[PDB]
Amino acid sequence: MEMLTKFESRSSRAKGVAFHPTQPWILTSLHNGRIQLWDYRMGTLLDRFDGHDGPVAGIAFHPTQPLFVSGGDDYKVNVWNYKSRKLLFSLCGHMDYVRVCTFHHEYPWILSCSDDQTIRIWNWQSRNCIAILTGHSHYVMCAAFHPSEDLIVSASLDQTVRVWDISGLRMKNAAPVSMSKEDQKAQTDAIVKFVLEGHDRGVNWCAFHPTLPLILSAGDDRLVKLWRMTASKAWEVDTCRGHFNNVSCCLFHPHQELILSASEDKTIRVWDLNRRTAVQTFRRDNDRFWFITVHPKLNLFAAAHDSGVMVFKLESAWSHE
Ligand code: NA
């Protein structure tokens, strides 16, 4: 395959990137604490947001509302409005670096995970933490909501990938439960479902396929593992072998039978979904890769590395959507 580079931002080290769903924009999160907003079609810096002390890693747009969320070294989960360019509020509760933060696709929730070994779910309309998911025994490097089921997947330096059942939390809103405040005691929602144990080093990333019942995980063992599941069980399918340093990030191509991964070995690698064979490698001479993302609808990719960010399309080699 070949990379058709649409945009590059040259900068100090970048840690995260987020596509806007409809505008030709990316947010970037930088090790220096700044968040950049770029129009990648024209190559224009639209805005820069300074709301963090120290590195920012988590960054994501809301899928339909004019908001984004950010998190990093200063422990706070910040909610911004990009139209008013305001930092609206900060959600506090994490006790260490926030690695990932995202919005749910339907419920008014933010998911965050942290070096404090927890995952938190927040209600961004009430501005309260509604669940703390404990059990990992080292940094939680990644967490993601499942796109259609009441599940979360998380990855940790404790060498495990966890799938959590959050159906109890979802059902709480509409339950016919009433409370007389004068009769309360002095003052379940999330349970771990699978503890996937296959990695023998720390795990840096995990991803759900947007439509198929598949999970990818990757980490310090240099491996990308593919898992499949039903409502009642999961299984390890295969491993993509070849990276020669820590794997930072991995994802599914939504519309082709391909897996992508990115690594401190200075490569982005494409693999066949059905056979796990190597399809194509792309390299940078001087830059480790920290993150990759795919646009949900367009076949457009972005990567964060030691010297900035790139936005690109992937095409079959020698082919001159
Ligand atoms: Na996702």
How does this model look, in words?
The protein is built from 1 helix and 28 strands. The chain is mainly β and 321 residues long. The protein has one domain. 42% of the residues are buried. Oligomeric complex that consists of at least the alpha, beta, beta', gamma, delta, epsilon and zeta subunits. This is Putative coatomer subunit alpha.
Descriptive terms for the model:
mainly beta, 4-stranded antiparallel sheet, 53% strand, binds sodium ion, 321 residues
* N- to C-terminal distance: 14 Å
Number of helices: 1
Distinct ligand kinds: sodium ion
Portion in strands = over 45%
Shape descriptor reads globular
Helix content estimate: under 10%
Subunit structure: Oligomeric complex that consists of at least the alpha, beta, beta', gamma, delta, epsilon and zeta subunits.
Organism: Schizosaccharomyces pombe (strain 972 / ATCC 24843) (Fission yeast)
Protein name: Putative coatomer subunit alpha
Subcellular location: Cytoplasm; Golgi apparatus membrane
